[PDB]
Amino acid sequence: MVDYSDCFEGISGGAIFYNTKNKEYNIYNKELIETRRSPCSTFKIVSTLIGLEKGVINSKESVMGYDGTEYPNKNWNKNLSLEEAFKESCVWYYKKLIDKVDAKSVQNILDDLKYGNCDISEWEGDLKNGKGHLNGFWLESSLQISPKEQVQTMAKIFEGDTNFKKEHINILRDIMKIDVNDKNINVYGKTGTGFDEKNKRVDAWFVGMLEREGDTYYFAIKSDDSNKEITGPKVKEIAINIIKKYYS
C-alpha cells in the first residue's frame, strides 16, 4: 500500500494505479478504492463504446440533434460533436444516445465488462433531484462501481480483452486525451461529479490511463469528501499532481 495523501491536500479520497505487465496495483486507501459508488460522468467511457457498437454514433464528429433547450451549462447549448460532448460532460447528448439502445443490450454489455453492480434498474435516474431529463442510471442512481473495478474495466477495454471493435476503442482513446504540459507522458481520462444526498458526500472522479516509456498504468482517483467544492475537475488536478510526483 502506497501513500499519495500529500497530493490530496487533506481532501478525503483514494487512488489506484494498475500495471498490466507485472499485474501489480499501487493502492492509496484500500477500503475506499474497494467501495462501490455512482460512476457519474466517468460512465461516458463505456456509454461512448455502447453508442459506437450500436451505430447510434460513428465518429468523433457524430451529433445527436439539439432541440434548442437552454441548459445552465452554456457549453451544452448547441448540436455538439461526440468529442465536445465527452469533454464538456454533456449529459443530454449521452442520455439521448443511451435511450436509443435496448436495456437488454446495455445489461449484457455491462455484465460482460463486470461493470460493478451492473444495475440499470433506475434507467431515468434520480428524478427526486428535480433535474427532470438531466438524469440517468449512471448519475447518483442505481449503477455503482468501485475505483478498483473502474481500473479493471479500463484495462480490459484498452488491452483488447472485450467484444468492442478496436476502431471504436481508438475513437474513445482520442477524445479521452488530456494536455498535462509534458510530451514525454500521455494521459487520458474522464471526470465525474455527483453528490450522494443519502450519505452527504461527493462522488468526485478522474478515471483513465497513463502511457510513459514502455509502461501503461490504468488509474482511478476518487474523493468522498464532505465539501461540495470537491468536483471531478478538482480530482483531475490531484490525479495530475500524483502522476507528476510518483509516475514521472
CSV table of C-alpha atoms in Angstrom, one decimal:
chain,number,residue,atom,x,y,z
A,1,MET,CA,0.0,0.0,0.0
A,2,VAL,CA,1.4,3.4,-1.1
A,3,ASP,CA,0.6,6.9,0.2
A,4,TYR,CA,-0.5,9.8,-2.1
A,5,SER,CA,-2.1,11.8,0.7
A,6,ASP,CA,0.2,14.8,0.1
A,7,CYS,CA,-1.5,15.3,-3.4
A,8,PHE,CA,-5.0,15.3,-1.8
A,9,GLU,CA,-4.2,18.3,0.5
A,10,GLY,CA,-6.5,17.0,3.3
A,11,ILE,CA,-9.3,16.1,0.9
A,12,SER,CA,-10.8,12.6,1.7
A,13,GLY,CA,-10.0,10.2,-1.1
A,14,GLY,CA,-8.0,7.3,-2.6
A,15,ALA,CA,-6.2,6.3,-5.7
A,16,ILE,CA,-5.4,3.0,-7.6
A,17,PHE,CA,-2.9,2.5,-10.4
A,18,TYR,CA,-2.7,-0.9,-12.2
A,19,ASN,CA,0.2,-2.0,-14.5
A,20,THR,CA,-1.0,-4.9,-16.7
A,21,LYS,CA,2.7,-6.0,-17.3
A,22,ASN,CA,3.6,-7.0,-13.7
A,23,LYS,CA,-0.2,-7.3,-12.7
A,24,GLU,CA,0.6,-5.1,-9.6
A,25,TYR,CA,-1.8,-2.5,-8.1
A,26,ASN,CA,-0.5,0.7,-6.4
A,27,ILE,CA,-3.2,1.4,-3.8
A,28,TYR,CA,-3.8,4.5,-1.7
A,29,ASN,CA,-6.7,4.0,0.8
A,30,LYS,CA,-7.7,0.3,0.2
A,31,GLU,CA,-11.1,0.5,1.9
A,32,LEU,CA,-12.2,3.5,-0.3
A,33,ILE,CA,-10.9,2.0,-3.6
A,34,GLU,CA,-12.9,-1.2,-3.0
A,35,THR,CA,-16.1,0.8,-2.2
A,36,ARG,CA,-18.8,1.0,-5.0
A,37,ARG,CA,-20.2,4.4,-5.8
A,38,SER,CA,-22.1,6.0,-8.7
A,39,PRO,CA,-19.6,6.4,-11.6
A,40,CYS,CA,-21.4,9.7,-12.6
A,41,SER,CA,-19.9,11.1,-15.9
A,42,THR,CA,-17.0,8.5,-15.9
A,43,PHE,CA,-19.7,6.2,-17.4
A,44,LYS,CA,-19.2,8.1,-20.6
A,45,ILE,CA,-16.1,5.9,-21.1
A,46,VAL,CA,-18.4,2.9,-21.6
A,47,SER,CA,-21.6,4.7,-23.0
A,48,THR,CA,-19.3,6.0,-25.8
A,49,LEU,CA,-18.4,2.4,-26.8
A,50,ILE,CA,-22.0,1.3,-26.4
A,51,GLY,CA,-23.1,4.1,-28.8
A,52,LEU,CA,-20.4,3.2,-31.3
A,53,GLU,CA,-21.1,-0.6,-31.2
A,54,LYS,CA,-24.8,0.0,-31.7
A,55,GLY,CA,-24.4,2.6,-34.5
A,56,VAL,CA,-26.1,5.5,-32.6
A,57,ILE,CA,-22.8,7.4,-33.2
A,58,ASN,CA,-19.9,6.6,-35.6
A,59,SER,CA,-17.1,9.1,-35.1
A,60,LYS,CA,-15.6,12.0,-33.0
A,61,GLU,CA,-17.8,14.3,-35.2
A,62,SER,CA,-21.1,12.4,-34.5
A,63,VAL,CA,-24.0,14.7,-33.5
A,64,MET,CA,-27.3,13.6,-31.7
A,65,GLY,CA,-29.5,16.6,-32.7
A,66,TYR,CA,-30.1,19.6,-30.4
A,67,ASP,CA,-33.7,20.6,-29.5
A,68,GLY,CA,-32.7,24.2,-28.5
A,69,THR,CA,-33.2,23.5,-24.7
A,70,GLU,CA,-31.3,26.3,-22.8
A,71,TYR,CA,-29.1,24.4,-20.2
A,72,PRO,CA,-27.4,26.0,-17.2
A,73,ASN,CA,-24.0,24.9,-18.7
A,74,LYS,CA,-23.9,27.1,-21.8
A,75,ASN,CA,-21.2,24.7,-23.3
A,76,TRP,CA,-24.2,22.3,-23.8
A,77,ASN,CA,-26.4,24.8,-25.8
A,78,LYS,CA,-25.5,23.6,-29.3
A,79,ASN,CA,-25.5,20.5,-31.6
A,80,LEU,CA,-22.1,19.4,-30.2
A,81,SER,CA,-20.0,16.5,-31.6
A,82,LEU,CA,-19.0,13.4,-29.7
A,83,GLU,CA,-15.6,14.8,-28.8
A,84,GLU,CA,-17.2,18.1,-27.5
A,85,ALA,CA,-19.9,16.1,-25.5
A,86,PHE,CA,-17.3,13.9,-23.9
A,87,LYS,CA,-15.0,16.9,-22.9
A,88,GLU,CA,-18.0,19.1,-21.7
A,89,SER,CA,-19.6,16.0,-19.9
A,90,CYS,CA,-22.8,16.7,-21.9
A,91,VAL,CA,-25.5,14.6,-20.1
A,92,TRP,CA,-28.3,15.4,-22.6
A,93,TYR,CA,-26.2,14.1,-25.5
A,94,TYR,CA,-25.4,10.8,-23.7
A,95,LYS,CA,-28.9,10.3,-22.3
A,96,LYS,CA,-30.3,10.7,-25.9
A,97,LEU,CA,-27.6,8.2,-27.1
A,98,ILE,CA,-28.4,5.5,-24.4
A,99,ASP,CA,-32.2,6.0,-24.9
A,100,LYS,CA,-31.7,4.6,-28.5
A,101,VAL,CA,-30.2,1.3,-27.0
A,102,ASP,CA,-32.3,-1.6,-25.7
A,103,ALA,CA,-31.8,-2.1,-21.9
A,104,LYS,CA,-31.1,-5.8,-22.6
A,105,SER,CA,-28.1,-4.7,-24.9
A,106,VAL,CA,-26.8,-2.4,-22.1
A,107,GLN,CA,-27.3,-5.1,-19.4
A,108,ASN,CA,-25.4,-7.8,-21.4
A,109,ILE,CA,-22.5,-5.3,-22.2
A,110,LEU,CA,-22.1,-4.2,-18.5
A,111,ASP,CA,-22.4,-7.9,-17.3
A,112,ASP,CA,-19.7,-8.9,-19.8
A,113,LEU,CA,-17.5,-5.9,-18.7
A,114,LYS,CA,-18.2,-6.8,-15.0
A,115,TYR,CA,-19.1,-3.1,-14.6
A,116,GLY,CA,-19.7,-3.1,-10.8
A,117,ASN,CA,-23.3,-3.9,-9.7
A,118,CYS,CA,-24.4,-3.6,-13.4
A,119,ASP,CA,-27.7,-2.2,-12.0
A,120,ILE,CA,-29.5,-0.1,-14.7
A,121,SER,CA,-33.0,-0.6,-13.0
A,122,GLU,CA,-33.4,3.1,-12.4
A,123,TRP,CA,-33.0,3.9,-16.1
A,124,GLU,CA,-34.3,7.5,-15.9
A,125,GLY,CA,-32.1,8.2,-12.8
A,126,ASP,CA,-32.9,10.0,-9.5
A,127,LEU,CA,-35.9,12.3,-10.5
A,128,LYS,CA,-36.2,13.3,-6.8
A,129,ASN,CA,-33.3,15.8,-7.6
A,130,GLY,CA,-35.8,17.9,-9.7
A,131,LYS,CA,-33.5,17.9,-12.8
A,132,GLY,CA,-36.0,16.0,-15.0
A,133,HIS,CA,-34.4,14.6,-18.2
A,134,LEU,CA,-30.8,15.6,-16.9
A,135,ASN,CA,-30.6,12.2,-15.1
A,136,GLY,CA,-29.8,8.6,-15.7
A,137,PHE,CA,-29.0,5.3,-14.0
A,138,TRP,CA,-25.2,6.3,-14.0
A,139,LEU,CA,-25.8,9.6,-12.2
A,140,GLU,CA,-26.2,9.2,-8.3
A,141,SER,CA,-28.7,6.4,-9.2
A,142,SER,CA,-28.8,2.5,-9.4
A,143,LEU,CA,-25.4,1.8,-11.1
A,144,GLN,CA,-22.4,1.6,-8.8
A,145,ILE,CA,-18.7,0.6,-9.3
A,146,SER,CA,-15.6,0.8,-7.2
A,147,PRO,CA,-12.4,2.6,-8.2
A,148,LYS,CA,-10.6,-0.8,-8.4
A,149,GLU,CA,-13.5,-2.1,-10.7
A,150,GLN,CA,-13.0,1.1,-12.9
A,151,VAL,CA,-9.3,0.3,-13.4
A,152,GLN,CA,-10.1,-3.4,-14.1
A,153,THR,CA,-12.7,-2.3,-16.7
A,154,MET,CA,-10.3,0.3,-18.3
A,155,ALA,CA,-7.6,-2.4,-18.5
A,156,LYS,CA,-9.9,-5.0,-20.3
A,157,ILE,CA,-11.1,-2.3,-22.8
A,158,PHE,CA,-7.6,-0.9,-23.7
A,159,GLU,CA,-5.7,-4.2,-23.6
A,160,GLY,CA,-8.3,-5.6,-26.1
A,161,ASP,CA,-10.0,-8.2,-23.8
A,162,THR,CA,-13.6,-7.0,-24.6
A,163,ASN,CA,-16.0,-7.5,-27.6
A,164,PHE,CA,-15.7,-3.8,-28.6
A,165,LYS,CA,-14.1,-3.1,-32.0
A,166,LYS,CA,-10.6,-1.7,-32.0
A,167,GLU,CA,-11.7,1.2,-34.3
A,168,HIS,CA,-14.2,2.3,-31.6
A,169,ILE,CA,-11.7,1.9,-28.7
A,170,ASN,CA,-9.3,4.2,-30.8
A,171,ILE,CA,-12.1,6.9,-31.1
A,172,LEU,CA,-12.6,6.7,-27.3
A,173,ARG,CA,-8.8,7.0,-26.7
A,174,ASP,CA,-8.6,10.1,-28.9
A,175,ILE,CA,-11.5,12.0,-27.1
A,176,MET,CA,-10.0,11.0,-23.6
A,177,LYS,CA,-6.6,12.5,-24.3
A,178,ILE,CA,-5.8,15.5,-21.9
A,179,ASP,CA,-2.9,18.0,-22.0
A,180,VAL,CA,-0.5,17.8,-19.0
A,181,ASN,CA,2.3,20.1,-20.3
A,182,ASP,CA,4.7,17.0,-20.9
A,183,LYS,CA,5.0,15.2,-24.3
A,184,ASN,CA,7.1,12.5,-22.5
A,185,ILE,CA,3.9,11.1,-21.0
A,186,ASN,CA,0.4,10.5,-22.5
A,187,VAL,CA,-2.5,11.0,-20.1
A,188,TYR,CA,-6.1,10.0,-20.9
A,189,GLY,CA,-9.2,10.2,-18.7
A,190,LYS,CA,-12.7,11.3,-17.8
A,191,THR,CA,-14.0,13.4,-14.9
A,192,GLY,CA,-17.1,12.6,-12.8
A,193,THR,CA,-19.1,14.8,-10.4
A,194,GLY,CA,-22.0,13.9,-8.2
A,195,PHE,CA,-23.3,14.4,-4.6
A,196,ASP,CA,-24.5,11.4,-2.6
A,197,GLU,CA,-27.5,13.0,-0.9
A,198,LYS,CA,-28.2,10.0,1.3
A,199,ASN,CA,-24.6,9.9,2.8
A,200,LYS,CA,-23.9,13.6,2.3
A,201,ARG,CA,-20.6,13.0,0.5
A,202,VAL,CA,-19.3,13.9,-3.0
A,203,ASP,CA,-18.6,11.4,-5.7
A,204,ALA,CA,-15.6,13.1,-7.5
A,205,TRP,CA,-13.7,11.1,-10.0
A,206,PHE,CA,-10.9,11.1,-12.5
A,207,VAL,CA,-10.5,7.7,-14.3
A,208,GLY,CA,-8.1,6.9,-17.2
A,209,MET,CA,-4.7,5.7,-18.1
A,210,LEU,CA,-1.0,7.0,-18.3
A,211,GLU,CA,1.3,5.8,-21.1
A,212,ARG,CA,5.1,6.5,-20.3
A,213,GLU,CA,8.2,4.9,-21.8
A,214,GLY,CA,7.2,1.3,-22.1
A,215,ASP,CA,4.8,1.3,-19.2
A,216,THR,CA,1.0,1.8,-19.1
A,217,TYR,CA,-1.0,2.4,-15.9
A,218,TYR,CA,-4.8,2.3,-15.6
A,219,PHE,CA,-5.9,4.6,-12.8
A,220,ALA,CA,-8.9,5.7,-10.8
A,221,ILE,CA,-8.7,8.8,-8.4
A,222,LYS,CA,-11.7,9.2,-6.1
A,223,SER,CA,-12.8,11.6,-3.4
A,224,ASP,CA,-15.7,11.1,-0.9
A,225,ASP,CA,-15.1,14.5,0.8
A,226,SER,CA,-18.0,16.3,2.7
A,227,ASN,CA,-17.1,19.6,0.8
A,228,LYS,CA,-19.3,20.0,-2.3
A,229,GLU,CA,-16.5,22.2,-3.8
A,230,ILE,CA,-14.7,18.9,-4.5
A,231,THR,CA,-15.7,18.0,-8.1
A,232,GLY,CA,-14.3,15.7,-10.8
A,233,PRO,CA,-12.1,18.7,-12.2
A,234,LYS,CA,-10.6,19.1,-8.7
A,235,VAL,CA,-9.8,15.3,-8.5
A,236,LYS,CA,-8.3,15.6,-12.0
A,237,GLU,CA,-5.9,18.3,-10.6
A,238,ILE,CA,-5.0,15.8,-7.7
A,239,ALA,CA,-4.5,13.0,-10.3
A,240,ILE,CA,-2.1,15.1,-12.4
A,241,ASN,CA,-0.1,16.0,-9.3
A,242,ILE,CA,0.1,12.3,-8.3
A,243,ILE,CA,1.3,11.4,-11.9
A,244,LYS,CA,3.9,14.3,-11.8
A,245,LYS,CA,5.3,13.2,-8.4
A,246,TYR,CA,5.0,9.4,-8.5
A,247,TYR,CA,4.8,8.4,-12.2
A,248,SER,CA,7.3,10.9,-14.0
